[PDB]
Design a protein around this ligand. Sequence first.
Ligand code: LU8
Ligand code: LU8
Ligand code: LU8
Ligand code: LU8
Lengths: 292, 281
Amino acid sequence: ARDITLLECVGKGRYGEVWRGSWQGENVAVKIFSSRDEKSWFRETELYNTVMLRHENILGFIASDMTSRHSSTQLWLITHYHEMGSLYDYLQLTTLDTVSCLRIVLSIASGLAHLHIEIFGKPAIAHRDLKSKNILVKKNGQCCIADLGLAVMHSQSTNQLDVGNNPRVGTKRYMAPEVLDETIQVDCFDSYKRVDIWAFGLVLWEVARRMVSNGIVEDYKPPFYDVVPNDPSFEDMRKVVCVDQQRPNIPNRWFSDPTLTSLAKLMKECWYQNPSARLTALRIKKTLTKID
Amino acid sequence: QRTVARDITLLECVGKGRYGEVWRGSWQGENVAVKIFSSRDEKSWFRETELYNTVMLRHENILGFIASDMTSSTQLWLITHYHEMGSLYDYLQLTTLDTVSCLRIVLSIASGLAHLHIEIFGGKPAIAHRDLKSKNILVKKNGQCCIADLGLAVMHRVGTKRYMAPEVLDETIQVDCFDSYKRVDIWAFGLVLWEVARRMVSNGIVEDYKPPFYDVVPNDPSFEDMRKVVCVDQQRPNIPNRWFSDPTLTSLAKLMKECWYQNPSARLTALRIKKTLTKID
Ligand SMILES: COc1cc(-c2cncc(-c3ccc(C4CCN(C)CC4)cc3)c2C)cc(OC)c1OC
Ligand SMILES: COc1cc(-c2cncc(-c3ccc(C4CCN(C)CC4)cc3)c2C)cc(OC)c1OC
Ligand SMILES: COc1cc(-c2cncc(-c3ccc(C4CCN(C)CC4)cc3)c2C)cc(OC)c1OC
Ligand SMILES: COc1cc(-c2cncc(-c3ccc(C4CCN(C)CC4)cc3)c2C)cc(OC)c1OC
């Protein structure tokens, strides 16, 4: 049974479209890529061939297809479906308690450490476009990371670095200083893990804002909402992050709450301009496991 | 908002080997060919899929792409048009040719190969096949052939040893020059032309089907077996006396010799082979 019914569009953008569909009686998500993003479809397909990629905090693969008749080509990725949508969607109109906030951020840290750490199997993987729209919320209150179209793979065992062929760059708002100033060391796998850590810090900030303490919570805002235009350019982001050395502000009410005080410390250790100074995904996971 | 019928019935296995399996299958009442990749040959699915993701080749003498499917182990399928007559290798075992059929076969292969080789601007990158042989050519009902298997193809697993050019066997191939890969294909084309020409009847005479170098290497030749024949002794396939009574086989012997020069830069181009074949008969 291979047949799929497309039922409703849950997303349309430059990337193409995502549909909720039905397959063997279950909801599935069906991404139809834009022709402009053909290199992402192939990269994501290479990533999902990985033996041991499957993980509770990585979006589960079902199938990938490239189909063509005559001069047109369709590119399909079929995954498990998450009715609750993306973390971006979820944070807009939900506040969190301590337990739910830590469950979300530990789950993301768990998925990211799973990507970053080689299994001797699965190569080490850097995501390169981590952000709240590329994280889905599951009914158990954990998240899963999505969109492996820009991912970098590395094997320490065979000294192989696979940066792939994709002129796509990460989401501008979430780019690390070394991406925005284009000094990043492109032939160095660790460089790409460190870009993920920067973006993780920004996602931590977005989530923490939505955790209630002492009857106070912040409204949902995207990173750098206060310092860049609504639809920021590459240069707008370079200005604030690299020229102005800006980082998201920590609300002072966080310092009254031990959990938010711990998270503020953890997101600052993701935001060093010096990429070597940033925490590892494993260290972040261990720290969040210790926090209550 | 719409049904996507992806179910492909696998009806009969038409090929099994180190590559995996090929099946005749059915989609929506329509025959398709389904190549199911072995783990051994997984990189061939990725290379061909990357090529078709870059350029959707469409040509009467190139096997028609339908789909690349990956299903979670991982199953990798390549789906193409189905040619019920099977491969040129299969076809030549039993079938003899007349002048018209022989020329139609070899001009159709040259047409496909020139299409791969040529860069078109606005179009397609230049493509070298890197495993051209009679098992990678399918026969169509209209008497033309199509070139199959772009799993080793390069745009601008090793080739089948029996068909490797001398510069591949002696490792002198100029790997920095894309033209080097075009010249390796032309060598293999000349061996295919010899295989076909042997089956063309003239004056009541035909040769039995044999693969290239059948009389000078073992059934399953080593790399070294091939290097000694092709590079050290500089042997070439035998041209039988009987061909020189037949004007078509006389022209085809000249053509195949111009594909087999030791110096890769002396070999004819696919475009010049086409021009030569349009002036025979
Ligand atoms: C993969 O292969 C096969 C596919 C199909 C098939 C099935 N549904 C829809 C389509 C289709 C419709 C419309 C467009 C275009 C039309 C113009 N513009 C508006 C952009 C969109 C593209 C595609 C096709 C091509 C049929 C086949 O055989 C009959 C195939 O071959 C086995
Ligand atoms: C990020 O990337 C991928 C995501 C998905 C995916 C999987 N489950 C659920 C969804 C979803 C459902 C529903 C909403 C709602 C949100 C609020 N409002 C009601 C509008 C709609 C949002 C999101 C998506 C988008 C599939 C993908 O590929 C098949 C993705 O690409 C890898
Ligand atoms: C995912 O997988 C397989 C799919 C198919 C297949 C089956 N029905 C219809 C289609 C179809 C084609 C094209 C459109 C177009 C229409 C307009 N345009 C602007 C957007 C999209 C829609 C639908 C396809 C591609 C066949 C398969 O096997 C032969 C598949 O598996 C490999
Ligand atoms: C070379 O490579 C590929 C070839 C094909 C392919 C396409 N049409 C038809 C065939 C075929 C059908 C039938 C027979 C035989 C069966 C027994 N009978 C006694 C004579 C006839 C042989 C061959 C094949 C093998 C598909 C591929 O991929 C999907 C290939 O790989 C790219």
